Design a protein around this ligand. Structure first.
Ligand code: HEC
Ligand code: HEC
Ligand code: HEC
Ligand code: HEC
Ligand SMILES: [Ca+2]
Ligand SMILES: [Ca+2]
Ligand SMILES: [Ca+2]
Ligand SMILES: [Ca+2]
Ligand SMILES: [Fe+3]
Ligand SMILES: [Fe+3]
Ligand SMILES: [Fe+3]
Ligand SMILES: [Fe+3]
Ligand code: NA
Ligand code: NA
Ligand code: NA
Ligand code: NA
Ligand code: NA
Ligand code: NA
Ligand code: NA
Ligand code: NA
Lengths: 151, 150, 145, 151
């Protein structure tokens, strides 16, 4: 019985709100466990890259290096819960401050998990701060390519 | 095909960018004529509403009333060529200045024509400044409700 | 003169007023546009209040470039309009300045903003026709085109 | 030796340019020790308030609650060195990422210390995490109220 909460207000997120897609295995798994099955799925990561460019790149940069909103590929966080997949989904679904609007009406839950897998795949921060990774994944993790513009 | 120019630099746009698919009838007609077939197709306009909310509403508002970027439903334009569909397409595809980046990597040319059709559908400006409309359309054009957001 | 919000069109509520502020409230004309000392002071206030969002050379960053002849709001090509936009704010991040800055400080900023203009004389609606005829555009910032 | 380093790059900060202003007691003392004399000066806190509204509120909110940039009054920091006065000065002076540009051309070093004193005055986090406070101040610490806009 997971309690999903708004990143800014702490209000409960009603996950039945917003754009309905097919009720996929990744979404049912996520609603039960806060684990994103697409983190390891190369096909899903590819589809997440394309959804991030459409929905996110204008504010976060085509390499998640940050532009108007922050870098999403680094181990620095505005909200520390965004280091884990339950928090990241909450921030995307429910929105945060200012121009970071909720995406519940723009994207299905399955599309958000695709985008989330892609955001994790381009990570260039330290394994020690990667809360979404298992101890096994950390031990075997190489930081991805830093974007130039991250300085 | 016509020559499509970048709104900021005046340089020619590469419309062949990407490998998402082959041109739709609407896209091939638009590249030849600058006319957007979706402007009068209610189904195309609804798909464009959803595409606009996902790609554009963060910076231009959920009613195209403006937020970080300008209102798109009014009859003033920062770039007056955006009152016609050729200009509008060039601005979206190629980008403009500051936070208005090019969309050629975010959206297919067909999705952009879907978005443009929805943007024209919500216009609340005068018929006389609506350069994308035909005289038949201008005679029967009634402005959309001005959103209370703006 | 009646002063209106750039976005809503609502009245702006506008004392120990300077000559420039009294002249501005009666005419919509900014005396500081030709006062080199006032343009220097406006540079320092612009860097404090504006450069974070509009850049150190008014080239644009969060908000638009202010030195070019493209406007989001066409009235910002005249000093009455520009004053309304700064005083009363616009959309999103462009908040009202009426509590942060005096009217006199705003006129200093506006004088500096006009001093770094790099667009066309034709679109410079704050210049008289004789100022246009003797127009000397400022350098175009490297981070703009 | 007290060396000031850029929050993003780690490069030594050059303090000889920007808005020169005047060498003040508070600035000389801070460049020698990393201690902000303005922190306990109610007159300086009031001046810092007006400088923050003019220079900072557009991105950080009128109550330092966050808007486009982070909340500054809470006890979570994107960059944990900002919990001390040396780190906070470095981030303000030399900037951070995305839209947090350097402020050394916008403000004198003295103006920055005024803003910093005001930011510490509105702090609503825990005494345990307020590194800039002496242990007298921390044993006597009363956090400011949480502004509504923080949510
Ligand atoms: C501009 C209109 C934006 C779009 C589109 C998206 N984001 Fe965003 N985001 C933006 C800002 C201005 C901020 C800071 C807001 C705040 O409350 O401080 C954000 C924040 C995020 C975060 C938090 C990051 C952290 O360090 O904690 C995440 C994870 C984030 N945004 C993700 C994200 C994704 C995946 C988007 C596409 C669906 C997306 N954002 C769109 C501005 C904008
Ligand atoms: C924030 C990251 C933005 C996103 C996402 C989109 N737009 Fe935008 N747009 C933005 C700004 C800051 C500006 C002004 C730029 C300038 O050079 O003045 C714009 C401008 C436009 C225009 C020009 C309108 C005019 O008056 O001439 C159009 C037609 C426009 N934008 C459309 C648009 C569409 C359809 C988007 C989704 C695909 C979109 N923009 C995204 C900021 C942002
Ligand atoms: C970030 C928090 C900002 C600060 C501080 C200032 N401005 Fe701004 N400005 C900003 C945005 C995001 C926009 C677009 C808003 C909109 O409603 O479309 C603006 C807009 C302006 C304009 C309009 C320009 C036009 O082309 O019509 C002007 C003249 C303007 N801003 C001036 C300005 C001055 C002088 C400031 C210091 C007092 C200032 N702005 C601060 C974002 C931000
Ligand atoms: C908008 C153009 C901004 C203005 C004006 C100011 N700040 Fe800012 N700040 C902004 C963003 C987008 C961020 C996040 C940057 C990042 O690298 O993550 C910041 C960050 C800060 C911080 C870091 C806080 C932390 O948790 O570590 C501080 C201390 C900070 N900003 C202070 C600050 C002050 C005092 C300002 C007025 C002089 C100021 N900022 C202006 C965006 C913007
Ligand atoms: Ca958190
Ligand atoms: Ca034009
Ligand atoms: Ca106007
Ligand atoms: Ca640190
Ligand atoms: Fe980019
Ligand atoms: Fe809205
Ligand atoms: Fe700059
Ligand atoms: Fe505010
Ligand atoms: Na991060
Ligand atoms: Na970050
Ligand atoms: Na328009
Ligand atoms: Na407009
Ligand atoms: Na302009
Ligand atoms: Na402009
Ligand atoms: Na914070
Ligand atoms: Na903090």
């Amino acid at each position: 019985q997971l309690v999903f909460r708004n990143t800014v207000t702490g209000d409960v997120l009603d996950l039945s709100f917003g754009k309905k897609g097919e009720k996929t295995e990744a979404v049912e798994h996520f609603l039960n466990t806060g684990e994103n099955l697409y983190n390891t799925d190369d096909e899903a990561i590819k589809a997440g890259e394309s959804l991030f460019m459409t929905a996110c790149s204008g504010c976060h940069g085509h390499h998640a290096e940050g532009k108007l909103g922050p870098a999403l590929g680094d181990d620095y966080y505005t909200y520390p819960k965004n280091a884990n997949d339950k928090g990241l989904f909450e921030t995307i679904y429910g929105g945060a401050r200012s121009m970071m609007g909720p995406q519940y009406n723009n994207l299905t839950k399955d599309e958000i998990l695709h985008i989330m897998a892609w955001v994790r795949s381009v990570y260039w921060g330290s394994a020690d701060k990667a809360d979404w990774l298992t101890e096994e994944q950390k031990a075997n993790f190489k930081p991805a390519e830093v974007p130039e513009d991250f300085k």
